[PDB]
């Protein structure tokens, strides 16, 4: 329960597991325009069973914006692996232990790239951390964008779903 520049952010209830899947189809949608293949592929990723398991694991978090749900992310406390696996770049440091950012979604009727910002940057503030990650895909330049403007630094790329182009932040408290 964090509020952030008139957000509320807070873990997913099980209830509002339709909200969320309306916004990630909301989201698959406005990636396809993009051309490219995240979240477009056979396996539905991410679908319903991925954000309930998020939801069981403690992962899901959500912001609300006049008492609508309009942003999700998935928040792991702990290593991938496959960011062990970074080349052409390497990391600000090797620490196993992390913050990982996935399966960020963002309402565009709540349009600007103003709301990610302010979830993004609201569960940095709630979270000790201090060492954030993320990754995306290589033509998410909406993306790119948000975690260029949060201070994350472009470190290289990993071999996720072909390639991600992998980012870091370390909060400053």
């Not at 597991?17 to 325009?33: H, S, T």
């Amino acid at each position: 329960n964090l509020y952030f520049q008139g957000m509320q952010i807070r873990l997913a209830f099980p209830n509002e597991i339709d909200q969320i899947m309306l916004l990630i189809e909301e989201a698959r949608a406005e990636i396809a325009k993009t051309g490219s293949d995240q979240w477009q592929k056979e396996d539905g990723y991410p679908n319903r069973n991925d954000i309930i398991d998020d939801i069981l694991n403690g992962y899901a978090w959500v912001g609300i914006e006049d008492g609508m749900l309009a942003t999700y992310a998935a928040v792991i406390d702990g290593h991938e692996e496959v960011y062990d696996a970074i080349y052409e770049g390497k990391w600000l440091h090797d620490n196993h232990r992390y913050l990982t950012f996935h399966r960020i979604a963002i309402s565009n009727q709540f349009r600007g790239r103003g709301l990610a910002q302010t979830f993004l940057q609201g569960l940095i503030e709630g979270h000790k951390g201090p060492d954030f990650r993320c990754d995306t895909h290589e033509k998410n330049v909406t993306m790119q964008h948000i975690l260029n403007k949060l201070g994350y630094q472009y470190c290289g790329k990993v071999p996720l779903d072909g390639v991600r182009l992998a980012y870091q932040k370390i909060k400053e408290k």
